[PDB]
Amino acid sequence: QGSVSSVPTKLEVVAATPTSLLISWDAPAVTVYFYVITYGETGGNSPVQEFEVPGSKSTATISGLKPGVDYTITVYANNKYSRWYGISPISINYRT
Amino acid sequence: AQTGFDLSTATTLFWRPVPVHVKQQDREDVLEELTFRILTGVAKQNHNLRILRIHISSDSDLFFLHTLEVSEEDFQSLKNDQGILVDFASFPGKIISLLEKCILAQPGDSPRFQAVLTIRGGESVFKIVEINDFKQLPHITLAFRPG
């Protein structure tokens, strides 16, 4: 039943600047209402930033990073399973 | 206008394109993907008045915008005009699942769900209909406003 997946897949960095990243991912099987993208420094205990991207989009640009620090980038989809099932995220770590 | 949407503590529910059959007065009919942004929030003078807001825009025309706001008070009148049987707490999920049906719709579907927007200057009527072997059947009808 690959039909019912709600988690995005193969989230990856396609382009980068010292302080800028272009990420992309593949949509899940379910219709995505909108995406929530989260990012913060991989070192613990300082806050994750968040913003929203439309459900039809498959990329997003992120600004204002520190050069040479790694960030944990997380994408999840709001969808029909969002009412009663947990957030189902995909995550990567990326440097510079 | 009436409502008073806070907008600074709004919760986003839905933000994506939906195929809509647009019918305009002096233009040919168009099938285009319109962006729907669905938020809920509260009034700016009264945090206990819940409000549903729907904005329709396109990616191709930035100044194209049609809006709808339904307070929980407004919903009682609207619930009896259309024979709606859910409460206000569940109403946004029914709208979203109908929009989802029109995203998933295929030309050969029967029943086929279809979204329609008709425009008279300063007023527009949005409906999601189900086309079956016998009739076009409206599941919801909503009055929108420019801007």
Residue numbers in the entry:
A (entry chain D): -2 to 93
B (entry chain A): 11 to 157
What did the published study say regarding this structure?
Here, we developed monobodies against Chlamydomonas reinhardtii SAS-6, characterizing three in detail with X-ray crystallography, atomic force microscopy and cryo-electron microscopy.
In order to identify the binding epitope of the three monobodies to their respective target, we determined their X-ray co-crystal structure. Overall, we characterized structurally three monobodies that interact with distinct regions and have different structural consequences on their CrSAS-6 targets.
